[PDB]
From a paper:
Merbecoviruses from bats, pangolins, and hedgehogs pose significant zoonotic threats, with a limited understanding of receptor binding by their spike (S) proteins. Spike (S) protein is the major viral surface glycoprotein of MERS-CoV and forms homotrimers. For the MERS-CoV S-trimer, NTD is known to mediate cell adsorption by binding sialic acid, while RBD is known to bind the human dipeptidyl peptidase 4 (hDPP4) as the entry receptor. The S2 subunit mediates membrane fusion and exhibits a higher level of sequence conservation among CoVs.
Notably, the S-trimer of CN-[name] was identified to adopt both locked-1 and locked-2 conformations. All locked-1 merbecovirus S-trimers we determined are found to bind fatty acids in their RBDs, while fatty acids were also identified within RBDs of locked-2 SA-BatCoV S-trimer (right). In the CN-[name]-locked-1 S-trimer, the Domain C residue I613CN forms hydrophobic interactions with NTD residues Y50CN, F267CN, and Y321CN of an adjacent protomer. These hydrophobic interactions are stabilized by a hydrogen bond network involving Domain C residues G612CN, I613CN, S615CN, F618CN, and Y620CN, and T55CN, N259CN, and V318CN of the NTD from the adjacent protomer. In addition, the interactions between Domain D and S2 of the adjacent protomer are altered: In the locked-1 S-trimer, Domain D residue Y354CN interacts with S2 residues D784CN and K913CN, while in the locked-2 S-trimer, Domain D residue Y354CN interacts with S2 residue K786CN. Despite structural changes, the interaction between Domain D residue S353CN and S2 residue D784CN is maintained in both the locked-1 and locked-2 structures. In the locked-1 CN-[name] S-trimer, no density was observed for residues 677 to 690, suggesting that these residues form a flexible loop. In the locked-1 structure, the hydrophobic core is centered around F355CN, whereas in the locked-2 structure, it is centered around Y354CN, resulting in structural changes in Domain C. A similar reorientation of Domain C/D junction hydrophobic residues was observed for SARS-CoV and SARS-CoV-2 S-trimers transitioning from locked-1 to locked-2 conformation. In contrast, S-proteins of CN-[name], EU-[name], and SA-BatCoV are unlikely to bind sialic acid due to changes in key sialic acid–binding residues. Among our determined MERS-CoV S-protein structures, receptors for Japan-BatCoV, CN-[name], and EU-[name] remain unidentified.
Residue numbers in the entry:
A (entry chain C): 50 to 84, 90 to 202, 211 to 290, 294 to 338
B (entry chain B): 1013 to 1198
C (entry chain C): 772 to 856, 864 to 880, 884 to 892, 903 to 939, 947 to 1109
D (entry chain B): 339 to 575, 581 to 676, 691 to 727, 733 to 820
E (entry chain A): 1013 to 1060
Write the structure that this text describes.
């Protein structure tokens, strides 16, 4: 959504940072504990995708329906599960020759207490020296675990030092899909969410401006599993990368957007813009 | 021409409209800017005048075609159609010169006073043997079934002859007569 | 066939368009040289030319004699589309003015036109009222069927039209009811289904859309920054100093004056087109309407029989 | 407006008149005082690692700040310091570091030194104000302003491939090169650096930001964002709504000023963001703090026209579409209601005229005042001589009995004035400077001469 | 068409008629002025 102003019942050619047509993006899925012990996780955390201008995620789509457990052999219903994201400036190599270490001040985003609270820690992490938790040549990907505060698992996997603002936001517990976008400008980083101004559509509005004056260049999605025999499955969230593009949107009577052609998907849309 | 010559006194957001005044008052790096503004204004005025002349050329060409048509229709001949050569029925037209054009003098007819009268489609005898119709006129009655002939643009009745009457095919809409028939019908 | 013989009578003033009433912009326009008086003179000239053209056109429309009763009842053909009765307006004219996306006594109290009033231009009313224009049109009917003046019924007049084409007397007297049925069928086919697929109604809508688009562009060249920091002279006055205000207001004045000159040239071109259109309308009325033409193509495709003119 | 005394008789247009704004409105929802004391509180940051703060929803008092600094030179574009202390803008971004005035041209636009390419590079897309301020010793000791005597800037930032790393506009310096410069304790010009595996080449060059008297010189770059929404950063420096409605009123709401009329419309748009805009970037809406949506419009001028009569010397005023009601409520800046609009002159007459040389609009005339004002005459159609249709074989005819010639005079202008313009003699006056600037301007005189020659030949 | 394509080589008061030539020569603030002058010239030609 445009920041600071509202339009109504008009169609505007406005340019900004938007995802383009198609572009299904990366598809990420979390899973239950292996059916008890040894929580099951995916290849994530060895991938450091470029931040570029920013990204927007589809929060908790494919929920309220019957799906399938990723590690389970049977089918179960799927609920909304909030991703936890890592964002930093410089990435390097672990002592175990694995990728995913952030060598300076990094921003993490953690949902807390069964999705009631979400926190943003700007908290530079030192790798703890232990037996298997990021030791010498004994490594598996750090996993954020919780029962049926994720910072305790993070402090088990990492060491926290020079930590700054721990901004906490209250989000309601529901199974409706949302959206969440991160954009960086010269005023800092901007977080966007769909929960503000009531909850009516899929549009996102500005709700936080964290003072991150270092240019964020990499991001990764930290794995997360839930302790739970029982068959509980979790939804999928898709990451879409933004671009310096131009759009032509349409507003209804309320301050919302109904349809928005992308000027550049094909020639007819170039004419339509 | 007045609008063309009045753009020499327009400052166009400069210190003065005289190029010599700008040359004397100002330094070089501002001299070029002020003369650029002056050049923009004068060239815009010149292009506006060029477009004005080009627009007026089409109107002049269309008016030339119209003058040719009016001369070849209303002057050298009497126009059958009405309204193309002035108000009324055309009689004669004289063409004279004029400042930047042609002056036309059309002489109409313009009837003044009218008489309300009745007339038939044509006069035929008995059992539709041979019927006649008016040629540039109308058939009028004195009131005693005495049919006479009148002009199409003036009222002065005259007896019907074979010269102002043209033979036509019989119809049903004609008026049949019994006594005092005109000499063409005899 | 539709022939657009009118232009919009639009007047724009000096300082309400180039400026917004600020004394700084007015002073910088007075130092910029005098242009807007020329704009007012040119617009007054084209409006006077259009009013005189309309007066001459409706003087040439006028017939010396007319038969009001003939169009209403006498014709066995269903010519009620051109029958005149609030509005002295025929059915066809009501269909034309109703099925297009096109008053003056309380137009200010309403509030699109108020957007013109704040932008700095107005649309002048036409010289003849809609009722007077419709009555001038309705007087033209009643002289179509007259001469070979003499008042005639429409059926006999149609017989005389078709007799000179090459249809003999026995042909037309044999199947006159078929002729009336064909005429009524053609008129009904014209009346219904003419609002979606025809070139003439598309031309009417195109002319109305172009006349709206001219004013839309004239009002939309107010929001162009023209390279300045803002399109509002108030923001430039508040934000910048007294030395850099002159440059930005000069750029704004250049943009607005260029837009005004472009609109004036557009009005001149449209007037030069409308003069030719008015001459063509006069020719078509004095050839196809009051009489029967002998040359094909000049009064539509085919051999001409009769023609009517509506607003 | 026309510029001459003798005027032809006719109806003209004599410019609009606006309604002057009577009153004032002001909301300016209260905010917190700024934290600008941090600009003078801690150790002065160096150019290599310079601090940046972003201020939003803030109020600042410029006198208290400017009582502490001595401004040596300010370079501002698209804004002025006089406007920054009077106007309200959306956001404020301040960068500050220590730099001597002997290198005040290093930060100038277009410079080619190491600071403009390996240190803070200024961004010119928003209104900025770079201020070179000197803080004297007394105020520096008062606010605990100190110098660490270790100030340096990056003089070379090369990668592994032996090419310099240019810095993008309005960004902090490269984190590897900044850390390498900060970690050193001397001056080096080409020094290798091991940034967790990467081999970087860095160069550190020092400078002294103080003077003989101990006064510390600083550089304050201030970027102000003028956005479309409400302005929440204001400098420190009447009635209520529904006491005014339908009156042209200047605003002071949330730092946005202007003029126009408020009305109570139905709520339209999102309730959070205060203002509502249209396609042409013109504000039309306003959401109050109480949830009441006030729809906003410009105060609309009254379209007027003047009817002038020479040989009687009489002037009357007509209004384009203005009703007599809106005549009575607002100043104009008997009143006969007419299908065009109310007129301040004129007198009614039960008259008709066949044609009028002074038209007023929809078939209305203005006859010359031969009591004391104009006469509103209405043109109406005269009817032609009606002829009845007869069902019988005899039809009514109208044969004339008298006639008179009517001479019709028509003039058809079929010529244009054949004009040729010397472009060099018209654009310039023979001066060689103007001729050279026209030559470097790209030639236009050939096309003008060709076009005039073509139209004259045609 | 010859007059339409001959206004690309018009400097219009700028240092050069090529925008690429202006971009590599002048700084950020002067680039705006020169490109504004060029844009005004090309738009005037198009409207003509
Ligand atoms: C899966 O099913 C759940 C049912 O619990 C869906 O939640 C419901 O989603 C609808 C979407 O229109 C919500 O309606 C909207 O609610 C907001 C609340 O302010 C209201 O302002 C809107 O006008 C509209 O009525 C509905 O409230 C919500 N149910 C609850 C209890 O919150 C969910 O959307 C489904 N997910 C998918 C992907 O289909
Ligand atoms: C911005 O900050 C300045 C501080 O430099 C404020 O000036 C201060 O204004 C107040 C009242 O206008 C002054 O108080 C007065 O002091 C005299 C004695 O000096 C006393 O007799 C009066 O009754 C009153 O209390 C104060 O002295 C003055 N400060 C200085 C240093 O002169 C200014 O008001 C601030 N701006 C705003 C909008 O508040
Ligand atoms: N853990 C888990 N999460 C899931 O989301 C999940 N989903 C399924 C199957 N459910 C789904 C979810 C989405 C679509 C789907 O992508 N819908 C459409 C979109 C069509 C369009 O783009 O318009 C499709 O691609 O078919 C289909 C089946 C099975 N097991 C799961 N298990
Ligand atoms: C480089 O600059 C940053 C920002 O000015 C300094 O970070 C601050 O350091 C102090 C002291 O440790 C903390 O109290 C602040 O909270 C820090 N702020 C931020 C935003 O990180 C940093 O110390 C500077 N580097 C050096 C070597 O002095
Ligand atoms: C200053 C060196 C004088 C001699 C240089 C001679 C020739 C080199 C030619 C062109 C490059 C000139 C660089 C100008 C840098 C000054 C601006 C600054 O530094 O901010
Ligand atoms: C929105 O704009 C359209 C444009 O035509 C208009 O018809 C409609 O009445 C407006 N208002 C709504 C949809 O509430
Ligand atoms: C898993 O990630 C590693 C990166 O460490 C990559 O090399 C490998 O191809 C990935 N495997 C799959 C199946 O995605
Ligand atoms: C990044 O971390 C390293 C680790 O020692 C540190 O030296 C460096 O100063 C940090 N970067 C910044 C910008 O402080
Ligand atoms: C967030 O929620 C907690 C408890 O649910 C409450 O104490 C706190 O005040 C809330 N904060 C806000 C800003 O609503
Ligand atoms: C007049 O008489 C003839 C005689 O046959 C007839 O054919 C014709 O129809 C009659 N006309 C009228 C009008 O009665
Ligand atoms: C003529 O046509 C119209 C519309 O087709 C119809 O309403 C009217 O009744 C018709 N008149 C007749 C059949 O007399
Ligand atoms: C006087 O003016 C009024 C205006 O409403 C009009 O209705 C009336 O006909 C006029 N009287 C005349 C023309 O005699």
């Amino acid at each position: 959504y445009p920041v600071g102003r509202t339009y109504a019942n008009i169609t505007i050619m406005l340019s900004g940072l938007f995802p383009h047509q198609a572009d299904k993006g990366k598809q990420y899925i979390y899973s239950m504990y292996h059916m008890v012990n040894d929580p099951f996780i995916s290849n994530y955390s060895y991938y450091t995708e470029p931040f570029d201008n920013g990204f927007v995620v589809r929060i908790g789509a494919n929920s309220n329906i019957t799906g399938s457990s990723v590690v389970g052999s049977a089918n179960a219903t799927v609920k909304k599960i909030y991703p936890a994201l890592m964002l930093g400036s410089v990435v390097g190599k672990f002592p175990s020759n694995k990728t995913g270490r952030y060598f300076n001040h990094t921003l993490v985003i953690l949902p807390e207490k069964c999705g009631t609270q979400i926190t943003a820690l700007y908290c530079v992490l030192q790798p703890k020296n232990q037996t298997n938790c990021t030791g010498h040549t004994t490594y598996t990907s750090y996993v954020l675990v919780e029962n049926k505060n994720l910072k305790q698992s993070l402090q088990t996997w990492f060491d926290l030092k020079d930590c700054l603002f721990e901004k906490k936001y209250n989000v309601s517990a529901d199974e409706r899909e949302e959206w969440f976008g991160i954009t960086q400008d010269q005023q800092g980083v901007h977080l966007y969410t769909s929960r503000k101004n009531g909850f009516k559509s899929n549009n996102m509005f500005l709700f936080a401006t964290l003072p991150i004056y270092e240019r964020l260049r990499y991001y990764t999605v930290m794995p997360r599993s839930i302790k739970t025999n029982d068959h509980m499955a979790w939804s999928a969230f898709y990451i879409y990368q933004l671009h310096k593009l131009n759009y032509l949107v349409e507003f209804d009577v309320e301050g919302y957007i109904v349809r928005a052609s992308d000027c550049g998907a094909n020639d007819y849309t170039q004419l339509q813009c | 021409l007045s609008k063309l010559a009045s753009e020499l006194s327009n400052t166009f957001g400069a210190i003065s409209a005289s190029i010599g005044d700008i040359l004397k008052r100002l330094d070089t790096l501002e001299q070029e800017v002020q003369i650029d503004r002056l050049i923009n204004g004068r060239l815009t005025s010149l292009n506006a005048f060029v477009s004005q002349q080009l627009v007026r050329s089409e109107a002049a060409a269309r008016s030339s075609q119209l003058v040719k048509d009016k001369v070849n229709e209303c002057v050298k001949s009497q126009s059958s159609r009405n309204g193309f050569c002035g108000q009324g029925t055309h009689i004669v037209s004289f063409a004279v010169n004029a400042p930047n054009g042609f002056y036309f003098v059309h002489v109409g007819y313009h009837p003044t006073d009218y008489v309300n009268q009745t007339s038939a489609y044509g006069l035929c005898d008995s059992s539709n043997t041979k019927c006649i119709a008016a040629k540039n006129g109308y058939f009028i009655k004195n009131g005693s079934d005495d049919w006479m002939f009148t002009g199409s643009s003036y009222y002065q009745p005259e007896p019907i002859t074979n010269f102002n009457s043209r033979s036509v095919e019989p119809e049903v809409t004609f008026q049949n007569l019994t006594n005092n028939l005109p000499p063409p019908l005899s | 066939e539709f022939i657009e013989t009118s232009i919009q009578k639009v007047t724009v003033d000096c300082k309400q368009y180039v400026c917004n009433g600020f004394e700084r912009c007015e002073q910088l326009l007075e130092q910029y040289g005098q242009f807007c008086a020329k704009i007012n003179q040119a617009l007054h000239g084209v409006n006077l030319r259009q009013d005189d053209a309309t007066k001459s056109l409706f003087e040439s429309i006028r017939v010396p004699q007319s038969a009001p009763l003939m169009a209403s009842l006498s014709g066995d053909y269903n010519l009620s589309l051109f029958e005149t009765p609030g509005n002295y307006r025929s059915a066809l004219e009501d269909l034309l003015f109703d099925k297009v996306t096109l008053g003056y006594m309380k137009g200010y109290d309403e509030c699109l036109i108020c957007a013109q009033y704040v932008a700095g231009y107005k649309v002048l009313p036409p010289l003849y009222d809609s009722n007077m224009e419709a009555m001038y049109t309705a007087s033209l009917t009643g002289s179509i069927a007259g001469a070979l003046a003499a008042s005639l019924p429409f059926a006999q007049s149609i017989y005389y039209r078709m007799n000179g084409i090459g249809i003999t007397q026995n042909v037309l007297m044999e199947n006159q009811k078929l002729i009336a049925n064909k005429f009524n069928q053609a008129l009904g086919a014209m009346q219904t289904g003419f609002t979606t697929t025809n070139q003439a109604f598309q031309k009417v809508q195109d002319a109305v859309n172009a006349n709206a688009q001219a004013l839309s562009k004239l009002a939309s060249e107010l929001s162009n920054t023209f390279g300045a920091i803002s399109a509002s002279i108030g923001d430039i006055l508040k934000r910048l100093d007294t030395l850099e205000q002159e440059v930005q207001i000069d750029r704004l004045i250049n943009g607005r004056l260029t837009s005004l000159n472009a609109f004036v040239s557009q009005q001149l071109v449209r007037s030069e087109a409308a003069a030719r259109s008015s001459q063509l309308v006069k020719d078509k009325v004095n050839e196809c309407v009051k009489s029967q033409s002998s040359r094909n193509g000049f009064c539509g495709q085919g051999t001409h029989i009769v023609s009517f003119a509506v607003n | 407006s026309y510029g001459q005394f003798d005027m032809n008789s006719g109806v003209y247009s004599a410019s609009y008149f606006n309604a002057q704004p009577r009153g004032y409105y002001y909301v300016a929802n209260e905010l917190e005082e700024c934290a600008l004391d941090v600009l003078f509180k801690n150790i002065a940051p160096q150019i290599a690692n310079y601090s940046r703060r972003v201020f939003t929803n803030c109020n600042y008092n410029l006198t208290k700040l400017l009582s502490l600094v001595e401004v040596d030179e300010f370079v501002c574009d698209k804004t002025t310091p006089e406007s920054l202390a009077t106007g309200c803008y959306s956001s404020l971004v301040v960068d500050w570091f220590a730099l001597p005035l002997s290198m005040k041209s290093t930060l100038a636009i277009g410079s080619a030194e190491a600071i403009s390419m390996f240190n803070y590079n200024q961004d010119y897309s928003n209104p900025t104000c770079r201020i070179h301020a000197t803080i004297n010793s007394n105020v520096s000791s008062s606010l605990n302003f100190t110098a660490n005597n270790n100030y340096a800037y990056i003089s070379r930032c090369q990668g592994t491939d032996g090419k310099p790393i240019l810095l993008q506009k309005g960004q902090l310096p490269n984190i590897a090169c900044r850390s390498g410069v900060l970690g050193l304790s001397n001056d080096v010009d080409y020094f290798g650096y091991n940034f967790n595996g990467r081999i970087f080449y860095i160069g550190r060059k020092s400078y002294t930001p103080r003077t003989s008297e101990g006064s510390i010189q600083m550089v304050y770059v201030i970027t102000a964002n003028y956005a479309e929404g409400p302005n929440n950063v204001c400098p420190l420096k009447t009635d209520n709504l529904d006491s005014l409605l339908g009156q042209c009123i200047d605003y002071d709401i949330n730092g946005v000023v202007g003029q126009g009329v408020f009305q109570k419309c139905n709520s339209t748009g999102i309730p959070s963001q205060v203002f509502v805009y249209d396609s042409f970037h013109n504000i039309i809406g306003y959401h109050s703090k109480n949830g009441t949506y006030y729809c906003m419009a410009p105060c609309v001028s009254v379209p007027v026209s003047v009817i002038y009569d020479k040989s009687s010397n009489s002037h009357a005023t007509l209004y384009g579409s203005v009703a007599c009601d809106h005549i009575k409520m607002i100043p104009s800046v008997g009143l006969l209601q007419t299908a065009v609009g109310c007129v301040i002159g004129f007198h009614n007459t039960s008259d008709t005229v066949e044609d009028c040389n002074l038209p007023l609009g929809q078939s209305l005339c203005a006859k010359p005042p031969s009591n004391n004002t104009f006469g509103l005459a209405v043109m109406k159609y005269e009817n032609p001589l009606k002829v009845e249709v007869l069902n019988s074989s005899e039809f009514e005819i109208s044969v004339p009995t008298n006639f008179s010639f009517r001479v019709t005079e028509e003039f058809i202008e079929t010529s244009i004035q054949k004009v040729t313009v010397d472009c060099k003699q018209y654009v310039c006056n023979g001066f060689e400077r103007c001729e050279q600037l026209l030559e470097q301007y790209g030639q236009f005189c050939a096309k003008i001469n060709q076009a005039l020659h073509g139209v004259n030949l045609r």
